RNA sequence: CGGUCCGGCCGGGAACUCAAAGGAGACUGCCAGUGAUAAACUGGAGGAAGGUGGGGAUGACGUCAAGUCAUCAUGGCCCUUACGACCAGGGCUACACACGUGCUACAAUGGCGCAUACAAAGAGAAGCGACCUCGCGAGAGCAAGCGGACCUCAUAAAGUGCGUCGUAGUCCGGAUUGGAGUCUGCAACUCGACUCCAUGAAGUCGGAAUCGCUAGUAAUCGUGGAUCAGAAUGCCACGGUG
């Protein structure tokens, strides 16, 4: 199980849309040569570090939604390979039948 | 003007009858109906491991086919638009209208 | 390597080093930040950088400016096989 | 024929023969012959001497032959005495750029001794 | 009138129109020698009009799509065959014996799971 | 091939001449499915034989082909743990195949510049009954008439 | 067919390719011969296809106390100021060696330079990102279009034509290392991918032995996708030559 891993993951998700995709302006914009070429850009580069170590979209492991498995993820369904198979055979994923071409 | 209707579905019989329901209800208000045209179907494939552990060559291959139909209406009287916006089809069809 | 658009150094290390060059050299400055560029500002001070279990002290000469701190604290122990 | 590059390249096309000069590859050789106004399907034969030292001090504009070797080796000595990570790998004989060392480091470690 | 034929090979598709009484072979608004640089493709396209003989007795306007050189050449052959069969209706019997009428149905085989190719198997070793 | 006996597969003639034999030759010379390369090489070598040392341009090939074609072969047959080398007659098509293969493999292991002129020398000396394709034939024979008692 | 700026680009056409729904077609159905008046075998015709047309999915009763308590679920056992929980740094990338599976080579059926042909199948909104300008280049700036048979990824490579190299450890090979950079990312020391300049190991076809493949197959040449901020010689797919 390791429920605590799921807790870590959901905390990272929430805190990450908490800060970023809202305050990306500290790097996406102020780094521009047209924004600064001097102490302003340096002050922004150092300000980007006091935001928590989380809150980056680059720290989500993107686990399964039912069992929380790290590996074998499928972005289309949000499930691991095991769960998409066990649910596809039961007939719950629409339109997903066995392919043979 | 022209009004354009795009129909997407996961099976072809439901979307076939949905396109019917559209194109005769368009002729019911006496309108010219261009189509219906089958656009190419988009089939997305997936390949999964089927053991819980350590069995790399044992796999399953699934696919989802999306069927696409297009219909254009080129002589809309006012009783054609409402006459198309009142129509009841089962849940498998997604319609997108374009003015 | 990194972009020329700004070298990297942490905030806590930056403040610790400025206050240590104002206040005269001191204890081996204990740090964990192996990722920070060595600046001209601390030639002469002794920084004890973490290597996983210990803090290896390094005395910064002028040749070290531009390198990272972690380059001067090896993380793995190994001395022959047999 | 001798150049400022002290070596003596042999009688083949000039763009290839000037690469026997240590520190000059193919791009440098093309730049050399383009600044000298010399085509590069010309041999070291069939060439003037009032065309050879225009090459000689056209190539004198680069860091070349033994003076390059010194520049390289002291850049290695620097690391080897700095005590850095690249220095530890240079001073010992293991790959420096982060390659696998469990297997397949035979170019850096030489033929295998059991 | 136009006499028309459709021909297909591995992944190519060729449509062929033949007109009476002139010598133009034109494919994709190009000569035969401009299009097919390989004389084997040039030979394959002239095959059906060698038993069914001509000097310059019909001109043919061809277009092709898909595939490579051999696929397009074979598609054009098959299309010429079908077109001239619509033209005469009784050149069929000797074209059957030449093998020009059968649509070559060899398609490239799919790659299969666990295999490096359609049939090439990974190197096995006992231990 | 336990049960399913096989027929044959079609082969095109050659654009330039209209031969099946030489079309077999370029399939045996082709490597990696590069047919254009092999056609180029074989035309380049064969004209190089014809007007440098030679006849009407198809005859000059068959005269070198006949003098390397073997007439008898060795095939081995097991006892209970012994295998006799029994000499056997070679069938026509296998004769042409063996000749073409030996010519190609002798031409492959020479020391000259092109492949066309390597092929050229080998075919020229096969016309003169020397080289190493012809001696391949000579010693397959030698071994066949050494085991002449096991017919 | 008309017109044209010579591009299906406009009028226009619904023929053709194609798209995707429906339908037809192959059944030893037909004709000979053999066969136990058999079931079936050889051959022929017609036909796009002939004898299971090609490929796939489909894996009987059971075997190996085979594998997985680390996907999940679960009987019993064990921990409960720690075998639970949070954080920073490190490690999973170590290196005397041995083995398995791959990629690149040892060259002329080739290497390099210039010119020029012919694909299929896919993906895309915190996404794909054109045109133009700057940079030798990786890329940067500006910014259109696209939830897509429309826009982008994206100018396929082997191939063909011309020139050169002329059998060399080479104009083969591109490992290793030095310097200078780009981009993603809080952050590229340990430990990322890519670019430029320079460096140019081994390697000249591989012992005993051993593997795959019966036709669009083997061999070879490129393309795409999932995972994914970035990071394939792996995996899963696609066509070309053959
Ligand atoms: K050089
Ligand atoms: K390593
Ligand atoms: K349990
Ligand atoms: K680590
Ligand atoms: K590999
Ligand atoms: K290997
Ligand atoms: K070289
Ligand atoms: K990625
Ligand atoms: Mg990630
Ligand atoms: Mg690595
Ligand atoms: Mg293939
Ligand atoms: Mg495998
Ligand atoms: Mg029609
Ligand atoms: Mg069955
Ligand atoms: Mg067990
Ligand atoms: Mg076990
Ligand atoms: Mg366990
Ligand atoms: Mg940690
Ligand atoms: Mg590991
Ligand atoms: Mg050699
Ligand atoms: Mg078989
Ligand atoms: Mg290759
Ligand atoms: Mg690929």
From Swiss-Prot, chain A:
PROSITE patterns: RIBOSOMAL_S14 (PS00527). It comes from the Bacteria. Pfam families: Ribosomal_S14. Part of the 30S ribosomal subunit. Contacts proteins S3 and S10. NCBIfam families: PRK08881.1. GO terms for biological process: cytoplasmic translation; ribosomal small subunit assembly; translation. Keywords: Ribonucleoprotein, Ribosomal protein. One of its GO terms (molecular function) is rRNA binding. Gene3D superfamilies: 1.10.287.1480. InterPro entries: Ribosomal_uS14, Ribosomal_uS14_bac/plastid, Ribosomal_uS14_CS. This is Small ribosomal subunit protein uS14. The lineage of its organism: Bacteria, Pseudomonadati, Pseudomonadota, Gammaproteobacteria, Enterobacterales. HAMAP family: Ribosomal_uS14_1. The gene is rpsN. Binds 16S rRNA, required for the assembly of 30S particles and may also be responsible for determining the conformation of the 16S rRNA at the A site. Belongs to the universal ribosomal protein uS14 family. GO terms for cellular component: cytoplasm; cytosolic small ribosomal subunit; small ribosomal subunit.
Curated annotation (Swiss-Prot), chain C:
One of its GO terms (cellular component) is cytosolic small ribosomal subunit. The keyword Ribonucleoprotein applies. Pfam families: Ribosomal_S19. One of its GO terms (biological process) is cytoplasmic translation. GO terms for molecular function: rRNA binding; structural constituent of ribosome; tRNA binding. Keywords: Ribonucleoprotein, Ribosomal protein, RNA-binding, rRNA-binding, tRNA-binding. PANTHER family: RIBOSOMAL PROTEIN S19P FAMILY MEMBER, SMALL RIBOSOMAL SUBUNIT PROTEIN US19M. In the E.coli 70S ribosome in the initiation state it has been modeled to contact the 23S rRNA of the 50S subunit forming part of bridge B1a; this bridge is broken in the model with bound EF-G. The 23S rRNA contact site in bridge B1a is modeled to differ in different ribosomal states, contacting alternately S13 or S19. In the 3.5 angstroms resolved ribosome structures the contacts between L5, S13 and S19 bridge B1b are different, confirming the dynamic nature of this interaction. Bridge B1a is not visible in the crystallized ribosomes due to 23S rRNA disorder. Part of the 30S ribosomal subunit. Binds S13 and L5 and cross-links to the A site tRNA. Belongs to the universal ribosomal protein uS19 family. This is Small ribosomal subunit protein uS19.
Curated annotation (Swiss-Prot), chain E:
InterPro entries: Ribosomal_Su5_D2-typ_SF, Ribosomal_uS9, Ribosomal_uS9_bac/plastid, Ribosomal_uS9_CS, Ribsml_uS5_D2-typ_fold_subgr. The gene is rpsI. GO terms for biological process: cytoplasmic translation. Part of the 30S ribosomal subunit. Contacts 16S rRNA. Cross-links to the P site tRNA and weakly to the A site tRNA. The C-terminal tail plays a role in the affinity of the 30S P site for different tRNAs. Mutations that decrease this affinity are suppressed in the 70S ribosome. Disulfide bonds: none annotated. Keywords: Ribonucleoprotein, Ribosomal protein, RNA-binding, tRNA-binding. It comes from Escherichia coli (strain K12). Pfam families: Ribosomal_S9 (PF00380). GO terms for molecular function: RNA binding; structural constituent of ribosome; tRNA binding. This is Small ribosomal subunit protein uS9. The keyword Ribosomal protein applies. SUPFAM superfamilies: Ribosomal protein S5 domain 2-like. Belongs to the universal ribosomal protein uS9 family. GO terms for cellular component: cytoplasm; cytosol; cytosolic small ribosomal subunit.
Swiss-Prot record, chain F:
One of its GO terms (cellular component) is cytosol. The keyword Nuclease does not apply. Keywords: Ribonucleoprotein, Ribosomal protein, RNA-binding, rRNA-binding, tRNA-binding. It comes from the Bacteria. GO terms for biological process: cytoplasmic translation; negative regulation of translation; ribosomal small subunit assembly; translation. One of its GO terms (molecular function) is mRNA binding. The strain K12 sequence is shown. Has been predicted to contact the N-terminal domain of IF-3 based on footprint studies; exactly how IF-3 interacts with the 30S subunit is controversial. Belongs to the universal ribosomal protein uS7 family. One of the primary rRNA binding proteins, it binds directly to 16S rRNA where it nucleates assembly of the head domain of the 30S subunit. Is located at the subunit interface close to the decoding center, where it has been shown to contact mRNA. Has been shown to contact tRNA in both the P and E sites; it probably blocks exit of the E site tRNA. Protein S7 is also a translational repressor protein; it regulates the expression of the str operon members to different degrees by binding to its mRNA. Part of the 30S ribosomal subunit. Contacts proteins S9 and S11. Cross-links to IF3 and the P and E site tRNAs. This is Small ribosomal subunit protein uS7. It comes from Escherichia coli (strain K12).
């Amino acid at each position: 199980a390791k429920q605590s891993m799921k807790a870590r993951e959901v905390k990272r998700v929430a805190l990450a849309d908490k800060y970023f995709a809202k305050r990306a302006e500290l790097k996406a914009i102020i780094s521009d040569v047209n924004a600064a070429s001097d102490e302003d850009r340096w002050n922004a580069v150092l300000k980007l570090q006091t935001l928590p170590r989380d809150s980056s979209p680059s720290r989500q492991r993107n686990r399964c939604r039912q069992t929380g498995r790290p590996h074998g993820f499928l972005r289309k369904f949000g499930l691991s390979r095991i769960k998409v198979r066990e649910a596809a055979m039961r007939g719950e994923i629409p339109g997903l039948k066995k392919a043979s071409w | 003007q022209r009004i354009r209707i795009r129909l997407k579905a996961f099976d072809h019989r439901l979307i076939d009858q949905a396109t019917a329901e559209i194109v005769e209800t368009a002729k019911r208000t006496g309108a010219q109906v261009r189509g219906p045209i089958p656009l190419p179907t988009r089939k997305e494939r997936f390949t999964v491991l089927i053991s819980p552990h350590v069995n790399k060559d044992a796999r399953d291959q699934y696919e989802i086919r999306t069927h696409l139909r297009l219909v254009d209406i080129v002589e809309p009287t006012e009783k054609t638009v409402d006459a198309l916006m009142r129509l009841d089809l089962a849940a498998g069809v997604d319609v997108q209208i374009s003015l | 390597r990194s972009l020329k658009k700004g070298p990297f150094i942490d905030l806590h290390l930056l403040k610790k080093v400025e206050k240590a060059v104002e206040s005269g050299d001191k204890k081996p400055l204990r740090t964990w930040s192996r990722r920070s560029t060595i600046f001209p500002n601390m030639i002469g001070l002794t920084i004890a950088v973490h290597n996983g279990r210990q803090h290896v002290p390094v005395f910064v000469t002028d040749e070290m400016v531009g390198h990272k701190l972690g380059e001067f604290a090896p993380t793995r122990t190994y001395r022959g096989h047999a | 024929a001798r150049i400022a590059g002290i070596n003596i390249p042999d009688h083949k096309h000039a763009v290839i023969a000037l690469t026997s000069i240590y520190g000059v590859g193919k791009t440098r050789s093309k730049a050399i012959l383009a600044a000298a106004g010399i085509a590069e399907d010309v041999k070291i034969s069939e060439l003037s001497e009032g065309q050879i030292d225009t090459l000689r001090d056209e190539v004198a504009k680069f860091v070349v032959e033994g003076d390059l070797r010194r520049e390289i080796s002291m850049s290695i000595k620097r690391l080897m005495d700095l005590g850095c990570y690249r220095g530890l790998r240079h001073r010992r004989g293991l790959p420096v750029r982060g390659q696998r060392t469990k297997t397949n480091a035979r170019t850096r470690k030489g033929p295998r001794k059991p | 009138n136009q006499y028309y034929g459709t021909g297909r090979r591995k992944s190519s598709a060729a449509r062929v129109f033949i007109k009476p009484g002139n010598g133009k072979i034109v494919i994709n608004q190009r000569s035969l020698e401009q299009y097919f640089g390989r004389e084997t493709a040039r030979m394959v396209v002239r095959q059906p009009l060698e038993l069914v003989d001509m000097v310059e007795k019909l001109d043919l306007y061809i277009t092709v799509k898909g595939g490579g050189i051999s696929g397009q050449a074979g598609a054009i052959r098959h299309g010429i065959t079908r077109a001239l069969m619509e033209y005469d209706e009784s050149l069929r019997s000797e074209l059957r014996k030449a093998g020009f009428v059968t649509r070559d149905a060899r398609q490239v085989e799919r790659k299969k799971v666990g295999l490096r190719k359609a049939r090439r198997r990974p190197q096995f070793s006992k231990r | 091939p336990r049960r399913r006996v096989i027929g044959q597969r079609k082969i095109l003639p050659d654009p330039k001449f209209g031969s099946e034999l030489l079309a077999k030759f370029v399939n045996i010379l082709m490597v990696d499915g590069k047919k254009s390369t092999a056609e180029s090489i074989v035309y380049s070598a064969l004209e190089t034989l014809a007007q440098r040392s030679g006849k009407s341009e198809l005859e000059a090939f068959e005269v070198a082909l006949e003098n390397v074609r073997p007439t008898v072969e060795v095939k081995s047959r097991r006892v209970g743990g012994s295998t006799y080398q029994v000499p056997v007659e070679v069938r026509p098509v296998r004769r042409n195949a063996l000749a073409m293969r030996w010519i190609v493999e002798a031409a492959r292991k020479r020391g000259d510049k092109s492949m066309a002129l390597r092929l050229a020398n080998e075919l020229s000396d096969a016309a003169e009954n020397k080289g190493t394709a012809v001696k391949k034939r000579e010693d397959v024979h030698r071994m066949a008439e050494a085991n002449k008692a096991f017919a």
